[PDB]
A = this chain, B = another copy of it.
Amino acid sequence: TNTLQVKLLSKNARMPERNHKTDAGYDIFSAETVVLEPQEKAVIKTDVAVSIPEGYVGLLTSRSGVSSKTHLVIETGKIDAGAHGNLGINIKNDHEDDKMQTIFLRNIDNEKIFEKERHLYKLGSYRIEKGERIAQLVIVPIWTPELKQVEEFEERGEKFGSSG
């Protein structure tokens, strides 16, 4: 069986699409429109549940476009084989909370938002829109063997940057 089961949990959810043929990642879409303040942590719900087969792991990881342009930090999620729950994106707006305020919100391309209705926001605040690609899923085979205590092993020695 060379197929992965994908289950949508709501109308807000969307089917993950792969960009190119040789590409590794499945672009994951957001199911909600959230505003993240500086240093604010949240879990972005995808409303998408997947089933990874045994002997594999899913890497719900950051997209290189958004992560290099914005202060949005995604902690790569290790989706266990047999985890049939809602995939949540572990996000953090790492932008400095320098107490300053602006009238412009920022999107996932670090662009000033063009709101007709004026509001005051914290400097370095971002907005994730619904149906917006913020993360991607990369499935990679694992290796989980048995483990036993040993006094010594069956070499690089015992070396955190031994060289420079």
State A43–B160 Cα separation when bound (angstroms).
10
Give the contact-size bracket for chain A: 35 or more
Find the B residue at minimum CB distance from A27: B163
Instruction: Tell me whether A138 and B57 are in contact (CB under 8 A).
Output: yes
Instruction: Tell me whether A64 and B6 are in contact (CB under 8 A).
Output: no
**Chain B neighbourhood of A121, CB < 8 A:** none
A interface residues with partner B (beta carbon < 8 Å) = 2-8, 15-16, 18-26, 39, 41, 43, 49, 51, 54, 56-57, 61-69, 71, 73, 75-78, 80-86, 88, 90, 92, 94-98, 108-109, 133, 136, 138-164
Instruction: Tell me whether A75 and B62 are in contact (CB under 8 A).
Output: yes
User: Given A15-B147, A161-B63, does the pair A68, B81 have CB atoms closer than 8 Å?
Assistant: no
How many copies altogether? 3
Instruction: Tell me whether A64 and B82 are in contact (CB under 8 A).
Output: no
**Chain B neighbourhood of A142, CB < 8 A:** 24, 138-140
**Chain B neighbourhood of A16, CB < 8 A:** 147
Additional 19 contacts, C-beta under 8 A, given A22-B81, A24-B78, A49-B158:
A4-B146, A6-B147, A7-B149, A7-B152, A15-B147, A15-B149, A21-B54, A21-B82, A22-B54, A22-B80, A24-B144, A41-B68, A43-B68, A68-B160, A84-B153, A84-B155, A97-B98, A139-B145, A141-B141
